[PDB]
């Protein structure tokens, strides 16, 4: 019926960029928290 | 309403949408008719009231061939009307020999599980022989009939292949047209066939009105189902109901 490689293509090409963008946002927020002196460094 | 005389007293605008048009009429009396010569049964009506399909079910650690009930997926479009025939006597018995009328109606029923079973409810080409020489309560008759194909030769399947028209190959797969053997593995689906079936019906009379020359009773029938132009194995159907006829 369907091609098997499509499973790998769809799942990998969806999951990797999502984690990349989440990492960008989280590191930005962490730097912002670090710059302003507070309880969380 | 229940009798023909009450039904004739209503107007068409008074019956539309109620569902009375799909019902069968009722007879009142217990007399005898005795058909003369050149009689014809006219205005026959047959209404099923129960459907069942033969299957294999499990009762307790065993499997048996049992008829399971089914629900009608279509709507009130399953009653046969207007059937006419010619009566005669052979050796003291009555023979019907059905001739014309609305004697077929498609129907679809659903089995427990989700499967849909279409079939062609019909009494076409029926010859029924009775056990007596007069129409009286207790009279019985029955015989075999012929079931035509569900789809005729002009039907086209979703890929454009038919019986007397349409393509004769799977045009979407040109890679199957090579070698000494081509698409020989699709021959069953590329070669449409139309073969006739068979059935059996048994009827019994309960009420007879002499002054109106009417009869009524119950019936039990069984036949085969749709075959999808010869690509699947047909099933078996069982039905029960009532009937009405006039000897005028």
């Amino acid at each position: 019926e369907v091609q098997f490689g499509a499973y790998l293509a769809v799942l990998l090409g969806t999951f990797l960029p999502v984690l990349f963008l989440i990492n960008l946002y989280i590191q930005t927020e962490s730097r912002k928290a670090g710059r302003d002196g507070g309880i969380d460094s | 309403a229940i009798t023909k005389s009450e039904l004739n007293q209503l107007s068409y605008l008074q019956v539309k949408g109620t569902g009375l048009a799909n019902r069968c009429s009722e007879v009142i009396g217990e007399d005898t008719i005795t058909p003369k010569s050149g009689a014809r049964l006219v205005d026959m009506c047959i209404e099923p009231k129960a459907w069942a399909v033969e299957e294999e079910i499990g009762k307790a650690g065993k499997t048996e061939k049992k008829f399971v009930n089914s629900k009608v997926m279509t709507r009130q479009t399953y009653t046969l009307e207007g059937i006419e025939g010619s009566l005669k006597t052979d050796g003291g018995k009555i023979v019907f020999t059905e001739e014309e009328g609305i004697d077929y109606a498609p129907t679809t029923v659903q089995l427990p599980g989700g499967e849909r079973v279409p079939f062609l409810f019909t009494v076409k080409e029926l010859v029924a022989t009775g056990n007596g020489g007069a129409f009286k309560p207790g009279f019985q008759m029955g015989g075999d009939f012929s079931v035509p194909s569900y789809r005729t030769g002009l039907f086209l399947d979703p890929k454009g292949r038919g019986g007397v028209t349409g393509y004769d190959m799977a045009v979407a797969l040109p890679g199957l047209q090579s070698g000494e053997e081509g698409d020989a593995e699709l021959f069953k689906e590329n070669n449409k066939t139309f073969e006739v079936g068979n059935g059996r019906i048994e009827m019994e009379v309960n009420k007879v009105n002499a002054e109106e020359s009417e009869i009524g009773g119950v019936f039990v029938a069984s036949q085969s189902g749709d075959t999808d132009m010869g690509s699947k194995v047909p099933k078996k159907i069982l039905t029960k109901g009532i009937f009405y006829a006039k000897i005028q």
């Binding site: - | 650690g61 065993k62 499997t63």
Partner: protein
């Protein structure tokens, strides 16, 4: 047939494997019928049984 189906070694829970994934129908297939009970006899009519 249901009573005879319980006496088959393929339904023993202690007969599987750790990395054999899937339903039990993946190993033998789907059953349909019971062939019957075989009885073995030698040349003298004495009954024999397979261990």
């Amino acid at each position: 047939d249901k009573l005879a189906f319980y006496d088959y070694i393929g339904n023993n829970p202690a007969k599987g494997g750790l990395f054999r994934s899937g339903p039990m129908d993946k190993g033998d297939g789907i059953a349909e019928a019971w062939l019957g009970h075989p009885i073995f006899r030698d040349k003298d009519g004495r009954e024999l049984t397979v261990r």
